[PDB]
């Protein structure tokens, strides 16, 4: 019964994240956790793990037996050893090139699901709306096209690649249904409402009741709504900073006349005409009056007080950095570089991967996999694979 | 129905990137990611990878058997060993010189596709327009000329070079169609429009509807359009800095008269005539008036307040560097040198290589390949090649 | 507008403002002043 989101209190609180009032150096760390970033990393390492580990061991057995028979007809223990190593290296290169080019074209492909818009709701409100999108028919052709791209990758002649690529077609199928099934509205066009009787939260995306998860419930203390997210707390310090930058520019324009009085092209110019312009200007002599048409003055004093402005924003920047580091537990590289570390994956990717995006068969990231390259993931996912034991089992004749 | 791009708000926002208002030392880092740069590197390492790895092993077998028979008729295990090493070194030099001269003339060749103009849309708007260009007939002759240059490189007498150069002609053919097929308009001459009903974005490149990708959607909060790109956030701090440099030059020209009053050739001169010129000048005595033709003055004070200008631009430069490093995740070399690092390749080259430029069969860069020389790429791409295993397989007799 | 302005119209706006001259009064309709001092104390 009481309005929550489209109020001049809350829409003022959203534009601080866009940068409109007191954008200082600490706020730029907030854009370090709005990249697609780790979410593209966990979709990558899930499809790489599923396409590798489902393979068997007996297919690799006759495939190497197909290999060594092709080398026994050409060119005896040292002879077998150099052929075995070459075969394994060639197989690793082929498996590496058979996944990472297929997996990018489905990664950077347009998705109605954006991890960027989910963060802008978790910060500054604490609750996330979601909209159901059933399917769209061009994605069915995009399923068929990667399936027409799947048998084109089957053009190579090896046993394991036909078995790997079949599940990879199936694994990219089930992900691409869910990565386009939930759309998140921006920050406008939806209203969030609070009926007090059996008090829940209801969203209206253009006259239709939709799903809405609440992660940190806002406290409605009988006159207003205060949120829990770490922009509501900084709401008072930012405007206390921003209304002095608007005030220091007032103090810097009254102390611009070189002489004051009690009354009872420029940046690139010839500098002789520029002085001749300003010396006849109305902006060269302050004339101030205090009278009630009979009232007389008694004394006059002059002061050049300019309020501190570079002191407020130094403190505001330090406060913003501290607030961002503590609530989301980001760890810097020592600054040099600001990374994700495992307590942030449970607190941000947790309610995203399992609660709003209906993604059931997917593991989260490991904190060493969160920010360590892209090829640094692939070789370690090959070393920790179930296939690499089957290869090293073949080392004993 | 509502105009977006050709407004005095947005075209003011584009000229900040050209450098027109408050160009300070931090903004120069923005030109460190507008070079052709890495995009010439990934076209290079794709054509080097395709031309090497498609070669077989049996052709190398009789080619060395052609080689050792030519050395057995001239000048027995140590004799074969020094000939084998020489053959391999000569082959490496020939393959290295058979690619890198052919690959440059097609690299630095004019392309309607410019990576420089795509960055200027991603920054400061967030969305990229693209125009379809079908083909132009002089490029067909440029396909024929490199094909007439291909058989001229076939003039050497070796088996593998005829097989390598044939695919290299085909590999440079399919790239050069796509690198001239999409033209990106500058920042003018196109309008981007927002119709609210079924709200999409439409571009009009001189009265024709063209393709337009949206990477970060702008929030249209019912009165204006605010973008998401990291120039919209710095739009308020730059003009707050630039309107004091325009104001400090006002304060520095009113305090240039050596004496003030209440009224109720030079840089290289003889310095005696120069003083004699200025002492009769109208720019040597300020005369200021405050009157309403009957109104009297009561007091007069003088102050030499000059607003801080070198303090604003020091802070603006630090803010610009921080904003650039965090949004695009560039890593400096410690500053000494500012490089690309892998999270920037997914966020910039990702939507370029796969979404606007129709480049399907191409892998992205590795973050060690992004900035490490040019000959440092070639030897490692030779060491990680599928050919180098076939050469080292020949080491065991 | 003040934080982003033409700085010639912005000075022309503020120079006619009521926020440019403090006028303070101490009287009991017969009571006279004897001295006046000014201080710029800003608390920590």
PDB file of C-alpha atoms in Angstrom, chain B residues 73-282:
ATOM      1  CA  UNK B  73      76.250 -38.251 -52.799  1.00  0.00           C
ATOM      2  CA  UNK B  74      78.638 -35.515 -51.643  1.00  0.00           C
ATOM      3  CA  UNK B  75      80.682 -36.170 -48.500  1.00  0.00           C
ATOM      4  CA  UNK B  76      78.386 -42.515 -40.515  1.00  0.00           C
ATOM      5  CA  UNK B  77      76.145 -41.665 -37.570  1.00  0.00           C
ATOM      6  CA  UNK B  78      78.015 -38.486 -36.640  1.00  0.00           C
ATOM      7  CA  UNK B  79      78.039 -37.595 -40.339  1.00  0.00           C
ATOM      8  CA  UNK B  80      74.249 -37.936 -40.513  1.00  0.00           C
ATOM      9  CA  UNK B  81      73.763 -35.925 -37.314  1.00  0.00           C
ATOM     10  CA  UNK B  82      75.450 -32.710 -38.450  1.00  0.00           C
ATOM     11  CA  UNK B  83      73.583 -32.884 -41.756  1.00  0.00           C
ATOM     12  CA  UNK B  84      70.226 -33.449 -40.000  1.00  0.00           C
ATOM     13  CA  UNK B  85      70.701 -30.355 -37.749  1.00  0.00           C
ATOM     14  CA  UNK B  86      71.722 -28.140 -40.723  1.00  0.00           C
ATOM     15  CA  UNK B  87      68.665 -29.308 -42.746  1.00  0.00           C
ATOM     16  CA  UNK B  88      66.280 -28.521 -39.831  1.00  0.00           C
ATOM     17  CA  UNK B  89      67.819 -25.034 -39.258  1.00  0.00           C
ATOM     18  CA  UNK B  90      67.621 -24.198 -43.005  1.00  0.00           C
ATOM     19  CA  UNK B  91      63.964 -25.391 -43.082  1.00  0.00           C
ATOM     20  CA  UNK B  92      63.097 -23.205 -40.051  1.00  0.00           C
ATOM     21  CA  UNK B  93      64.703 -20.139 -41.684  1.00  0.00           C
ATOM     22  CA  UNK B  94      62.881 -20.759 -45.005  1.00  0.00           C
ATOM     23  CA  UNK B  95      59.440 -21.250 -43.322  1.00  0.00           C
ATOM     24  CA  UNK B  96      60.022 -18.085 -41.196  1.00  0.00           C
ATOM     25  CA  UNK B  97      60.917 -15.997 -44.314  1.00  0.00           C
ATOM     26  CA  UNK B  98      58.059 -17.570 -46.378  1.00  0.00           C
ATOM     27  CA  UNK B  99      55.321 -16.237 -44.081  1.00  0.00           C
ATOM     28  CA  UNK B 100      56.256 -12.968 -42.389  1.00  0.00           C
ATOM     29  CA  UNK B 101      56.888 -11.023 -45.596  1.00  0.00           C
ATOM     30  CA  UNK B 102      53.697 -12.269 -47.235  1.00  0.00           C
ATOM     31  CA  UNK B 103      51.698 -11.570 -44.085  1.00  0.00           C
ATOM     32  CA  UNK B 104      52.724  -7.934 -43.673  1.00  0.00           C
ATOM     33  CA  UNK B 105      51.705  -6.733 -47.143  1.00  0.00           C
ATOM     34  CA  UNK B 106      48.182  -7.976 -46.422  1.00  0.00           C
ATOM     35  CA  UNK B 107      48.266  -6.572 -42.878  1.00  0.00           C
ATOM     36  CA  UNK B 108      49.228  -2.899 -43.398  1.00  0.00           C
ATOM     37  CA  UNK B 109      46.998  -2.894 -46.543  1.00  0.00           C
ATOM     38  CA  UNK B 110      44.066  -0.409 -46.415  1.00  0.00           C
ATOM     39  CA  UNK B 111      40.993  -1.859 -44.594  1.00  0.00           C
ATOM     40  CA  UNK B 112      37.535  -0.161 -44.387  1.00  0.00           C
ATOM     41  CA  UNK B 113      37.426  -1.866 -40.958  1.00  0.00           C
ATOM     42  CA  UNK B 114      39.193   0.317 -38.390  1.00  0.00           C
ATOM     43  CA  UNK B 115      39.675  -0.775 -34.788  1.00  0.00           C
ATOM     44  CA  UNK B 116      40.318   2.880 -33.902  1.00  0.00           C
ATOM     45  CA  UNK B 117      36.752   3.994 -34.604  1.00  0.00           C
ATOM     46  CA  UNK B 118      35.172   1.102 -32.714  1.00  0.00           C
ATOM     47  CA  UNK B 119      36.793   2.165 -29.441  1.00  0.00           C
ATOM     48  CA  UNK B 120      35.503   5.740 -29.781  1.00  0.00           C
ATOM     49  CA  UNK B 121      31.952   4.329 -29.816  1.00  0.00           C
ATOM     50  CA  UNK B 122      32.434   1.860 -26.935  1.00  0.00           C
ATOM     51  CA  UNK B 123      33.807   4.622 -24.796  1.00  0.00           C
ATOM     52  CA  UNK B 124      31.473   7.634 -24.546  1.00  0.00           C
ATOM     53  CA  UNK B 125      28.362   5.956 -25.955  1.00  0.00           C
ATOM     54  CA  UNK B 126      28.361   2.242 -25.223  1.00  0.00           C
ATOM     55  CA  UNK B 127      26.870   1.204 -28.581  1.00  0.00           C
ATOM     56  CA  UNK B 128      28.465   0.620 -31.987  1.00  0.00           C
ATOM     57  CA  UNK B 129      26.887   1.152 -35.419  1.00  0.00           C
ATOM     58  CA  UNK B 130      28.076  -0.849 -38.421  1.00  0.00           C
ATOM     59  CA  UNK B 131      27.516  -0.517 -42.175  1.00  0.00           C
ATOM     60  CA  UNK B 132      27.501  -3.368 -44.696  1.00  0.00           C
ATOM     61  CA  UNK B 133      29.914  -2.947 -47.599  1.00  0.00           C
ATOM     62  CA  UNK B 134      29.509  -5.824 -50.102  1.00  0.00           C
ATOM     63  CA  UNK B 135      32.740  -5.806 -52.162  1.00  0.00           C
ATOM     64  CA  UNK B 136      34.833  -3.475 -54.313  1.00  0.00           C
ATOM     65  CA  UNK B 137      36.392  -4.617 -57.570  1.00  0.00           C
ATOM     66  CA  UNK B 138      39.989  -3.484 -57.035  1.00  0.00           C
ATOM     67  CA  UNK B 139      40.277  -5.924 -54.128  1.00  0.00           C
ATOM     68  CA  UNK B 140      39.563  -8.778 -56.528  1.00  0.00           C
ATOM     69  CA  UNK B 141      42.700  -7.710 -58.389  1.00  0.00           C
ATOM     70  CA  UNK B 142      44.433  -7.454 -55.012  1.00  0.00           C
ATOM     71  CA  UNK B 143      43.386 -11.065 -54.462  1.00  0.00           C
ATOM     72  CA  UNK B 144      44.835 -11.936 -57.884  1.00  0.00           C
ATOM     73  CA  UNK B 145      48.061  -9.997 -57.275  1.00  0.00           C
ATOM     74  CA  UNK B 146      48.875 -11.851 -54.055  1.00  0.00           C
ATOM     75  CA  UNK B 147      47.947 -14.989 -55.994  1.00  0.00           C
ATOM     76  CA  UNK B 148      50.419 -13.861 -58.654  1.00  0.00           C
ATOM     77  CA  UNK B 149      52.741 -13.250 -55.710  1.00  0.00           C
ATOM     78  CA  UNK B 150      51.924 -16.725 -54.360  1.00  0.00           C
ATOM     79  CA  UNK B 151      53.227 -18.711 -57.335  1.00  0.00           C
ATOM     80  CA  UNK B 152      56.292 -16.445 -57.386  1.00  0.00           C
ATOM     81  CA  UNK B 153      57.001 -17.785 -53.887  1.00  0.00           C
ATOM     82  CA  UNK B 154      56.418 -21.278 -55.322  1.00  0.00           C
ATOM     83  CA  UNK B 155      59.575 -20.737 -57.428  1.00  0.00           C
ATOM     84  CA  UNK B 156      61.612 -22.417 -54.683  1.00  0.00           C
ATOM     85  CA  UNK B 157      62.137 -26.172 -54.918  1.00  0.00           C
ATOM     86  CA  UNK B 158      60.791 -27.909 -51.815  1.00  0.00           C
ATOM     87  CA  UNK B 159      57.757 -30.097 -51.189  1.00  0.00           C
ATOM     88  CA  UNK B 160      56.321 -28.539 -48.018  1.00  0.00           C
ATOM     89  CA  UNK B 161      56.427 -24.942 -49.271  1.00  0.00           C
ATOM     90  CA  UNK B 162      53.925 -25.666 -52.045  1.00  0.00           C
ATOM     91  CA  UNK B 163      51.527 -27.160 -49.496  1.00  0.00           C
ATOM     92  CA  UNK B 164      51.993 -24.376 -46.928  1.00  0.00           C
ATOM     93  CA  UNK B 165      51.605 -21.524 -49.400  1.00  0.00           C
ATOM     94  CA  UNK B 166      48.388 -22.852 -50.927  1.00  0.00           C
ATOM     95  CA  UNK B 167      46.432 -22.655 -47.670  1.00  0.00           C
ATOM     96  CA  UNK B 168      48.126 -19.340 -46.853  1.00  0.00           C
ATOM     97  CA  UNK B 169      46.662 -17.971 -50.083  1.00  0.00           C
ATOM     98  CA  UNK B 170      43.293 -19.362 -49.020  1.00  0.00           C
ATOM     99  CA  UNK B 171      43.659 -18.178 -45.419  1.00  0.00           C
ATOM    100  CA  UNK B 172      44.523 -14.624 -46.451  1.00  0.00           C
ATOM    101  CA  UNK B 173      41.625 -14.735 -48.904  1.00  0.00           C
ATOM    102  CA  UNK B 174      38.904 -15.340 -46.314  1.00  0.00           C
ATOM    103  CA  UNK B 175      40.285 -12.728 -43.914  1.00  0.00           C
ATOM    104  CA  UNK B 176      40.616  -9.973 -46.529  1.00  0.00           C
ATOM    105  CA  UNK B 177      36.961 -10.328 -47.520  1.00  0.00           C
ATOM    106  CA  UNK B 178      35.822  -9.638 -43.952  1.00  0.00           C
ATOM    107  CA  UNK B 179      38.356  -6.915 -43.103  1.00  0.00           C
ATOM    108  CA  UNK B 180      36.874  -4.728 -45.863  1.00  0.00           C
ATOM    109  CA  UNK B 181      33.197  -5.674 -45.591  1.00  0.00           C
ATOM    110  CA  UNK B 182      32.119  -3.571 -42.581  1.00  0.00           C
ATOM    111  CA  UNK B 183      32.599   0.194 -42.432  1.00  0.00           C
ATOM    112  CA  UNK B 184      32.173   2.134 -39.188  1.00  0.00           C
ATOM    113  CA  UNK B 185      30.986   5.766 -39.432  1.00  0.00           C
ATOM    114  CA  UNK B 186      33.006   8.351 -37.573  1.00  0.00           C
ATOM    115  CA  UNK B 187      30.973  10.013 -34.823  1.00  0.00           C
ATOM    116  CA  UNK B 188      28.925  12.358 -36.956  1.00  0.00           C
ATOM    117  CA  UNK B 189      26.699  11.696 -40.023  1.00  0.00           C
ATOM    118  CA  UNK B 190      24.709   8.933 -38.247  1.00  0.00           C
ATOM    119  CA  UNK B 191      21.776   9.327 -35.893  1.00  0.00           C
ATOM    120  CA  UNK B 192      20.740   6.761 -33.301  1.00  0.00           C
ATOM    121  CA  UNK B 193      17.085   6.781 -32.388  1.00  0.00           C
ATOM    122  CA  UNK B 194      14.917   5.270 -29.677  1.00  0.00           C
ATOM    123  CA  UNK B 195      11.374   4.434 -30.424  1.00  0.00           C
ATOM    124  CA  UNK B 196       9.620   3.638 -27.128  1.00  0.00           C
ATOM    125  CA  UNK B 197       7.114   1.096 -28.458  1.00  0.00           C
ATOM    126  CA  UNK B 198       8.945  -2.266 -28.478  1.00  0.00           C
ATOM    127  CA  UNK B 199      11.979  -0.289 -27.462  1.00  0.00           C
ATOM    128  CA  UNK B 200      14.972  -1.011 -29.694  1.00  0.00           C
ATOM    129  CA  UNK B 201      17.663   1.168 -31.268  1.00  0.00           C
ATOM    130  CA  UNK B 202      17.718   2.179 -34.925  1.00  0.00           C
ATOM    131  CA  UNK B 203      20.515   3.879 -36.863  1.00  0.00           C
ATOM    132  CA  UNK B 204      20.148   6.045 -39.973  1.00  0.00           C
ATOM    133  CA  UNK B 205      23.361   6.297 -42.013  1.00  0.00           C
ATOM    134  CA  UNK B 206      22.083   8.873 -44.536  1.00  0.00           C
ATOM    135  CA  UNK B 207      18.505   7.665 -44.779  1.00  0.00           C
ATOM    136  CA  UNK B 208      19.159   3.928 -44.600  1.00  0.00           C
ATOM    137  CA  UNK B 209      18.518   1.652 -41.633  1.00  0.00           C
ATOM    138  CA  UNK B 210      21.687  -0.254 -40.750  1.00  0.00           C
ATOM    139  CA  UNK B 211      22.958  -2.665 -38.109  1.00  0.00           C
ATOM    140  CA  UNK B 212      23.659  -1.412 -34.591  1.00  0.00           C
ATOM    141  CA  UNK B 213      24.900  -3.474 -31.666  1.00  0.00           C
ATOM    142  CA  UNK B 214      24.177  -2.291 -28.128  1.00  0.00           C
ATOM    143  CA  UNK B 215      26.790  -3.334 -25.589  1.00  0.00           C
ATOM    144  CA  UNK B 216      25.703  -1.302 -22.550  1.00  0.00           C
ATOM    145  CA  UNK B 217      22.145   0.037 -22.854  1.00  0.00           C
ATOM    146  CA  UNK B 218      21.647   3.689 -21.928  1.00  0.00           C
ATOM    147  CA  UNK B 219      19.184   4.451 -19.157  1.00  0.00           C
ATOM    148  CA  UNK B 220      16.456   6.819 -20.352  1.00  0.00           C
ATOM    149  CA  UNK B 221      14.916   8.088 -17.118  1.00  0.00           C
ATOM    150  CA  UNK B 222      11.963   9.956 -18.604  1.00  0.00           C
ATOM    151  CA  UNK B 223      13.628  13.328 -19.156  1.00  0.00           C
ATOM    152  CA  UNK B 224      17.070  12.666 -20.615  1.00  0.00           C
ATOM    153  CA  UNK B 225      19.431   9.957 -21.848  1.00  0.00           C
ATOM    154  CA  UNK B 226      22.370   8.893 -19.692  1.00  0.00           C
ATOM    155  CA  UNK B 227      24.891   6.418 -21.050  1.00  0.00           C
ATOM    156  CA  UNK B 228      26.814   3.717 -19.196  1.00  0.00           C
ATOM    157  CA  UNK B 229      30.241   4.159 -20.813  1.00  0.00           C
ATOM    158  CA  UNK B 230      33.082   5.550 -18.643  1.00  0.00           C
ATOM    159  CA  UNK B 231      32.976   9.039 -20.111  1.00  0.00           C
ATOM    160  CA  UNK B 232      29.410   9.813 -18.983  1.00  0.00           C
ATOM    161  CA  UNK B 233      30.526   9.451 -15.366  1.00  0.00           C
ATOM    162  CA  UNK B 234      33.508  11.762 -15.832  1.00  0.00           C
ATOM    163  CA  UNK B 235      31.324  14.291 -17.638  1.00  0.00           C
ATOM    164  CA  UNK B 236      30.538  16.212 -14.469  1.00  0.00           C
ATOM    165  CA  UNK B 237      34.087  16.364 -13.086  1.00  0.00           C
ATOM    166  CA  UNK B 238      35.643  17.561 -16.351  1.00  0.00           C
ATOM    167  CA  UNK B 239      33.356  20.549 -16.757  1.00  0.00           C
ATOM    168  CA  UNK B 240      33.715  21.371 -13.090  1.00  0.00           C
ATOM    169  CA  UNK B 241      37.449  21.484 -13.800  1.00  0.00           C
ATOM    170  CA  UNK B 242      37.220  23.280 -17.138  1.00  0.00           C
ATOM    171  CA  UNK B 243      35.022  26.103 -15.853  1.00  0.00           C
ATOM    172  CA  UNK B 244      37.709  27.086 -13.347  1.00  0.00           C
ATOM    173  CA  UNK B 245      40.520  27.272 -15.903  1.00  0.00           C
ATOM    174  CA  UNK B 246      38.187  29.590 -17.768  1.00  0.00           C
ATOM    175  CA  UNK B 247      37.605  31.368 -14.448  1.00  0.00           C
ATOM    176  CA  UNK B 248      41.209  31.574 -13.229  1.00  0.00           C
ATOM    177  CA  UNK B 249      42.156  33.383 -16.432  1.00  0.00           C
ATOM    178  CA  UNK B 250      39.445  35.892 -15.516  1.00  0.00           C
ATOM    179  CA  UNK B 251      40.955  36.386 -12.062  1.00  0.00           C
ATOM    180  CA  UNK B 252      44.474  36.659 -13.478  1.00  0.00           C
ATOM    181  CA  UNK B 253      43.540  39.487 -15.841  1.00  0.00           C
ATOM    182  CA  UNK B 254      41.756  41.685 -13.317  1.00  0.00           C
ATOM    183  CA  UNK B 255      44.777  41.606 -11.000  1.00  0.00           C
ATOM    184  CA  UNK B 256      47.144  42.901 -13.665  1.00  0.00           C
ATOM    185  CA  UNK B 257      46.916  46.616 -13.029  1.00  0.00           C
ATOM    186  CA  UNK B 258      49.658  47.602 -10.566  1.00  0.00           C
ATOM    187  CA  UNK B 259      47.374  50.220  -9.037  1.00  0.00           C
ATOM    188  CA  UNK B 260      43.613  50.041  -8.594  1.00  0.00           C
ATOM    189  CA  UNK B 261      41.159  52.830  -7.989  1.00  0.00           C
ATOM    190  CA  UNK B 262      37.611  53.683  -7.011  1.00  0.00           C
ATOM    191  CA  UNK B 263      36.202  56.144  -9.527  1.00  0.00           C
ATOM    192  CA  UNK B 264      33.267  58.206  -8.300  1.00  0.00           C
ATOM    193  CA  UNK B 265      57.634  41.924 -29.875  1.00  0.00           C
ATOM    194  CA  UNK B 266      57.044  42.124 -26.136  1.00  0.00           C
ATOM    195  CA  UNK B 267      58.613  38.707 -25.537  1.00  0.00           C
ATOM    196  CA  UNK B 268      61.661  39.805 -27.587  1.00  0.00           C
ATOM    197  CA  UNK B 269      62.148  43.561 -27.420  1.00  0.00           C
ATOM    198  CA  UNK B 270      64.638  46.269 -26.602  1.00  0.00           C
ATOM    199  CA  UNK B 271      63.119  46.521 -23.029  1.00  0.00           C
ATOM    200  CA  UNK B 272      63.504  50.309 -23.059  1.00  0.00           C
ATOM    201  CA  UNK B 273      60.973  50.866 -25.822  1.00  0.00           C
ATOM    202  CA  UNK B 274      58.904  48.014 -24.377  1.00  0.00           C
ATOM    203  CA  UNK B 275      58.614  49.784 -21.027  1.00  0.00           C
ATOM    204  CA  UNK B 276      57.954  53.049 -22.879  1.00  0.00           C
ATOM    205  CA  UNK B 277      55.113  51.342 -24.750  1.00  0.00           C
ATOM    206  CA  UNK B 278      53.383  49.856 -21.700  1.00  0.00           C
ATOM    207  CA  UNK B 279      53.589  52.951 -19.509  1.00  0.00           C
ATOM    208  CA  UNK B 280      51.133  54.799 -21.770  1.00  0.00           C
ATOM    209  CA  UNK B 281      48.882  51.759 -22.209  1.00  0.00           C
ATOM    210  CA  UNK B 282      45.217  51.612 -21.173  1.00  0.00           C
TER     211      UNK B 282
END
